[PDB]
Write a protein that binds this ligand. Structure first.
Ligand code: 4TK
Ligand code: MG
Ligand code: MG
Ligand code: ZN
Length: 889
C-alpha cells in the first residue's frame, strides 16, 4: 500500500501542454487515441517517464510517431506505464497511445462508464487515468482538444468541455463531434457525455459584462419534465455569485446532465456539470420535499466551483478543502439567502455536530488538510467538506461581510487561472484582517491550526456579575483532546459571537459582539451591565466546537423562549435534552447493571415542557424551528457524550423522554396537526415546478413530525388521520403515512399502496425504499429480505443499494441487535458491493464508524465483522485502507 505524504510534494519533471483525444465508442468496446504534446520541466533529473494508467488495454504506444517495444523500452503493470528515460527525449516531444476500455462493464462508476443508456465520465479524483495514460494529478494543467464518435441512433447527443467546433457524419450510422477547450485545466475536470438526451434550455445575461450564457439541463427522455427546478436553481446560483461576490460566468455555455448511476451528488466538470439524478431531477408529484433543497444546494455547489475549484484550482489533493470547504461555504450562504428560513443554518449545524463530530472523535479522525492518504477517495469526508466549510465561514464571522468580500476578492484576483494552497487563502484573509484591525502587525498565523489540527475543541464558560459595579465577566477556556494525529494540541483562534440577554424582559443588553479567543483561556469583561444577564453564546454557531455553556435549565429555557439567535435557542433546547438524556441513561443503566426490582427516573423538566407548549402555540413562531424542539437530538450527536453506549438503554431513555413530553403535549400536537393542514398541503402551485415555498415545506415537516409522535404514542383514532394522510398528493405526506403506520396493522396495506405509487418513477421508488428501510418495524429483518428479493435484486445502482440499507443502519434497537446480525448483514453487503464499487462499499461502512463507542459486547461484534471484511482476499484498496484506519491498524 503506497502512502502519499503532504510534506513530500514536488513539481513533476514533465509538462503536458496539449491533449488531443479521439474517443471511439462501439457496442463491445471504446477505443481511446491520445496525443500528448509534452515537454521537460526544470525539476527534471533524467528520471523515467511514468504515466498513470489503470485497467487500460494497450494496442500501441509511441514517442514522436515511433512505436515503443514492450519490455525493452517500457513496462506496464495495469497501473503504471513506465518508459525508461533513455527513450525519453530531452526537449518538446509527442507521446501517443491507443487503448481499449469497456464502459459497459465499468460498474465502479469511475473513469468512463455506462449508466443505463448514457455514456458518462467521472474523473475526480483519479478517474482520468482509467480513460487514458496521463500524469494524473491536478497540477498538470493542459489544453484539451477532444473528439467523440458513436452510433448516431443510440448516442445522438455528444458533449465535452469547451466549444463544439465540428459535427460530422461517419459511415456505418455513426457521427462525431469535436470539442476544443483552449483554457488550461487539470484532467479531473475533463468530462464526456454521450446519449439520447433531452433538454430544457434558457439564456442568462450576466450582470456586468452583459454576456449571453446558454444554459442547458439534460436527462433521459422519460424524466425530461423533472428538469425545471434545476434550471431555476442554476439561474439563482449565477445571480447570487454576481450579487454577493461580484463574480460572473466566463463561458458561453453551461451544461447540467443527470445520470441514474453516480457515486456521489454531482461533479463540477468545466461547462459540463454531471449530476446524480436524485440531485437534479424533481417534480411535485414524484418527489419528496427534501429533493428541492437538495437540488438547490447541489446545483449551487457545482456552479460556485467554477471559481473556487475550476478557475482557481488545487496544487495537490491535500489542498482538497480549499475548493470543497470553500464551495460548501458559498453553497451555504447561497442556500440561506434563497430559503429565508432559520432551519437552513440549523440543518447544517445538526449535520456537523452529529456526523462530523462522530468522525472527528473516531479512529478515522483527520484534519481538514490531511497529512497522508493511500486512496484519495477516502478523504472526501464530512470533515474536509463540512468542518472545512465552518472553517471557511469563520473568516466571514471574524472579518465581517465588508472585509470578507475584500479578502475573498484578493484571493480570486491573485490566484485566478492558477493552482493554490490553503496558505494562499489564509494569506488573502490576513490582508483583509490587517485592513480591518487598522495595523499591518496583525496576522492570522494561528488560524492555520484549523487546517492542521484534528479533533473537536471543547469550550467551557464561567460567569461572574458584580451588581454594585454593574460589571459582567465571561471566563472562557478551550481544550482539544489529544489523538493519534497530534501529541499536544494547541489553542485555536476561536471567534465567539455573543449577546447578553436581560432575563427580566428578554431584550438585548449589548450590540453585536464577536469575542476573539486566542489563548487556552481568557476573561472577557463587560462594563455598564445593568442586571445579571443570560449569555447568548456562539450565536449562529460561530465555531465548530463542543459548547459547554454551564447554564441552568432555567436559563436555557429563558433563552429558548426569548433569545434572538436561532441557533442559541436551538442549542439551549439541545442542552436541556442532553442533560435529561444523560441522567435517565445512567438511571436505566444502573438498574440494568444491578438488576434492580424497582428504581426511580428523573422526570423531564416541567417548565421545559411548558416552554415547548408556549412556542408551539405561538402563530408567529417558525414551523421548521418547532419541528426541531419537539425532536430529541440525533443519536449520533448523543453518542459523542456517552462511553460504552448500551444502545438498548439509550433506546429506553429516548422512549421514556418522548413519552413524558407526549403525556403532556399530545393534545397540543394533534390540535396543531389539524390546524396546519390548510396551509401546509395547499395545492395552489402544485403544477408550477418553478414555485417553491420553503416555509410551506417546513409546515409539512412539522405536521409529519407531529404525526410520527402521535402515532408512536398511539393517540386515540390517529390511524384515521394516517389513512387520510396517505391520500395526500404530496409524496412527503403519503410516504410519511407509510412509516408512521408501522405501529399499526395497516402497515403492509400502505406498503402496497405506496409501492404502486412509487414503482414507475426511478427516484420515487428509491425514496420508497428508504421509507421502508427506516420503518420502525419489529419484523424489519424479514422486510429487508422482501426488499432484496422483490425490488432490489442484483442492482448495481448505488442509489438502490444505499436506499435499501443505510436508513436501516440508523435503527437504534434493531440494527444494533445484540446477536450482531445487523452488523453481519451490512458487512455482507459491503463485501458484496466492494467487488464492483469500492467507493460505495466504504460509504456502506458508515455504521461501523462508532464501533469503539459502544458497549463491550457490541464493540466485539462490530470488530469481528470488520476483521472478517479485512480478510477478504479480493478486498479493494479503498475498503482496506478505510477499515485499517477505522480499526487502528
Ligand atoms: C454530495 C456532495 C458531498 C456535496 C458531493 O456531491 N460532493 C462531490 C463534489 O464535491 N462535487 O463538486 C464530490 C465529487 C467527487 C468526489 Br470523489 C466526492 C464528492
Ligand atoms: Mg480495462
Ligand atoms: Mg434502475
Ligand atoms: Zn464540490
Amino acid at each position: 500500500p503506497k502512502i502519499h505524504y503532504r510534506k513530500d510534494y514536488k513539481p513533476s519533471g514533465f509538462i503536458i501542454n496539449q491533449v488531443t483525444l479521439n474517443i471511439n465508442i462501439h457496442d463491445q468496446e471504446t477505443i481511446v487515441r491520445s496525443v500528448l504534446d509534452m515537454d521537460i520541466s526544470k525539476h527534471n533529473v533524467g528520471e523515467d517517464l511514468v504515466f498513470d494508467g489503470v485497467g487500460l488495454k494497450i494496442n500501441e504506444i509511441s514517442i514522436n510517431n515511433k512505436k515503443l517495444v514492450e519490455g525493452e523500452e517500457y513496462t506496464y503493470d495495469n497501473e503504471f506505464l513506465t518508459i525508461f528515460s533513455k527513450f525519453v527525449p530531452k526537449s518538446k516531444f509527442a507521446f501517443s497511445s491507443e487503448v481499449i476500455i469497456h464502459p459497459e462493464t465499468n460498474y465502479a462508476l469511475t473513469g468512463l462508464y455506462k449508466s443505463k443508456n448514457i455514456i458518462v465520465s467521472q474523473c475526480e479524483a483519479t478517474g482520468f487515468r482509467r480513460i487514458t495514460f496521463f500524469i494524473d494529478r491536478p497540477d498538470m494543467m493542459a489544453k484539451y482538444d477532444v473528439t467523440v464518435t458513436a452510433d448516431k441512433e443510440k448516442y445522438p447527443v455528444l458533449l465535452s468541455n469547451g466549444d463544439k467546433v465540428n459535427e460530422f457524419e461517419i459511415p456505418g450510422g455513426r457521427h462525431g463531434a469535436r470539442f476544443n477547450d483552449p483554457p488550461l485545466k487539470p484532467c479531473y475536470l475533463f468530462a464526456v457525455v454521450a446519449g439520447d438526451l433531452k433538454h430544457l434550455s434558457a439564456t442568462y445575461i450576466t450582470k456586468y459584462t452583459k454576456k449571453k450564457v446558454e444554459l442547458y439541463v439534460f436527462s433521459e427522455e422519460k424524466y425530461v419534465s423533472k428538469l425545471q427546478w434545476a434550471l431555476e436553481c442554476l439561474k439563482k446560483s449565477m445571480a447570487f455569485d454576481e450579487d454577493y461576490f461580484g463574480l460572473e460566468y466566463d463561458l458561453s455555455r453551461l451544461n447540467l446532465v443527470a445520470v441514474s448511476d453516480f457515486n456521489v451528488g454531482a461533479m463540477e466538470n468545466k461547462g459540463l456539470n454531471i449530476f446524480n439524478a436524485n440531485s437534479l431531477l424533481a417534480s411535485k408529484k414524484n418527489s419528496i420535499d427534501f429533493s428541492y433543497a437538495r437540488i438547490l444546494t447541489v446545483v449551487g455547489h457545482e456552479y460556485f466551483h467554477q471559481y473556487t475549484g475550476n478557475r482557481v484550482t488545487l496544487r495537490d489533493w491535500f489542498q482538497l478543502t480549499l475548493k470543497e470547504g470553500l464551495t460548501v461555504h458559498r453553497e451555504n450562504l447561497f442556500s440561506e439567502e434563497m430559503t429565508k428560513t432559520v432551519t437552513t443554518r440549523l440543518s447544517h449545524v445538526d449535520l456537523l455536530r452529529s456526523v462530523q463530530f462522530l468522525e472527528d472523535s473516531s479512529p478515522l479522525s483527520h484534519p481538514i488538510r490531511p497529512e497522508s492518504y493511500v486512496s484519495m477517495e477516502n478523504f472526501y469526508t464530512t470533515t474536509v467538506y463540512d468542518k472545512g466549510s465552518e472553517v471557511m465561514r469563520m473568516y466571514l464571522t471574524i472579518l465581517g461581510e465588508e472585509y470578507y468580500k475584500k479578502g475573498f476578492d484578493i484571493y480570486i484576483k491573485k490566484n485566478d487561472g492558477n493552482t493554490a494552497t490553503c496558505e494562499d487563502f489564509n494569506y488573502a484573509m490576513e490582508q483583509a484582517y490587517k485592513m480591518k484591525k487598522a495595523d499591518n502587525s496583525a496576522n492570522l498565523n494561528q488560524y492555520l491550526l484549523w487546517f492542521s489540527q484534528s479533533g473537536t475543541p471543547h469550550v467551557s464558560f464561567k460567569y461572574n456579575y458584580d451588581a454594585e459595579k454593574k460589571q459582567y465577566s465571561i471566563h472562557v477556556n478551550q481544550y482539544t483532546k489529544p489523538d493519534e494525529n497530534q501529541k499536544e494540541k494547541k489553542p485555536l483562534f476561536i471567534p465567539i459571537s455573543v449577546g447578553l440577554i436581560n432575563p427580566e424582559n428578554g431584550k438585548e443588553m449589548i450590540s453585536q459582539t464577536t469575542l476573539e479567543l486566542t489563548k487556552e483561556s481568557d476573561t472577557f469583561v463587560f462594563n455598564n451591565i445593568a442586571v445579571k444577564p443570560i449569555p447568548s453564546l456562539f450565536r449562529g454557531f460561530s465555531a465548530p466546537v463542543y459548547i459547554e455553556d454551564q447554564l441552568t435549565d432555567e436559563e436555557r429555557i429563558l433563552l429558548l423562549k426569548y433569545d434572538s439567535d436561532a441557533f442559541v435557542r436551538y442549542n439551549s433546547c439541545t442542552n436541556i435534552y442532553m442533560k435529561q438524556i444523560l441522567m435517565n441513561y445512567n438511571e436505566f443503566l444502573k438498574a440494568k447493571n444491578e438488576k434492580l426490582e424497582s428504581f426511580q427516573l428523573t422526570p423531564v423538566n416541567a417548565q421545559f415542557i411548558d416552554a415547548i407548549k408556549y412556542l408551539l402555540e405561538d402563530p408567529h413562531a417558525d414551523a421548521g424551528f418547532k419541528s426541531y424542539i419537539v425532536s430529541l437530538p440525533q443519536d449520533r450527536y448523543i453518542i459523542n457524550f456517552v462511553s460504552n453506549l448500551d444502545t438498548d438503554v439509550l433506546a429506553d431513555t429516548k422512549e421514556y423522554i418522548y413519552k413524558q413530553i407526549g403525556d403532556k403535549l399530545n393534545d397540543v400536537y394533534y390540535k396543531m396537526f389539524k390546524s396546519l393542514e390548510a396551509k401546509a398541503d395547499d395545492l395552489t402551485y402544485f403544477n408550477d415546478e418553478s414555485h417553491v415555498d420553503f416555509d410551506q415545506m417546513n409546515m409539512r415537516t412539522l405536521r409529519n413530525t407531529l404525526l410520527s409522535l402521535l402515532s408512536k404514542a398511539q393517540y386515540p383514532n390517529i390511524l384515521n388521520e394516517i389513512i387520510e394522510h396517505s391520500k395526500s398528493p404530496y409524496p412527503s405526506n403519503w410516504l410519511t403515512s407509510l412509516s408512521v403506520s408501522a405501529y399499526f396493522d395497516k402497515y403492509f396495506e400502505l406498503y402496497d399502496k405506496t409501492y404502486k405509487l412509487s414503482k414507475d418513477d426511478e427516484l420515487l421508488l428509491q425514496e420508497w425504499l428508504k421509507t421502508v428501510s427506516r420503518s420502525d418495524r419489529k419484523d424489519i429483518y424479514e422486510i429487508l429480505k422482501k426488499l432484496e428479493n422483490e425490488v432490489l435484486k442484483d442492482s448495481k445502482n448505488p442509489n438502490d443499494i444505499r436506499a435499501v440499507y443505510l436508513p436501516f443502519t440508523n435503527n437504534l434497537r434493531r440494527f444494533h441487535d445484540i446477536s450482531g446480525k445487523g452488523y453481519k448483514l451490512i458487512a455482507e453487503v459491503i463485501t458484496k458491493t466492494d467487488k464492483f464499487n469500492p467507493m460505495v462499499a466504504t460509504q456502506l461502512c458508515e455504521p461501523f464508524k462508532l464501533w469503539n463507542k459502544l458497549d463491550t459486547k457490541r464493540q466485539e461484534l462490530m470488530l469481528n465483522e470488520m476483521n472478517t471484511m479485512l480478510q477478504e482476499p479480493q478486498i479493494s484498496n479503498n475498503l482496506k485502507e478505510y477499515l485499517l484506519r477505522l480499526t487502528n491498524k
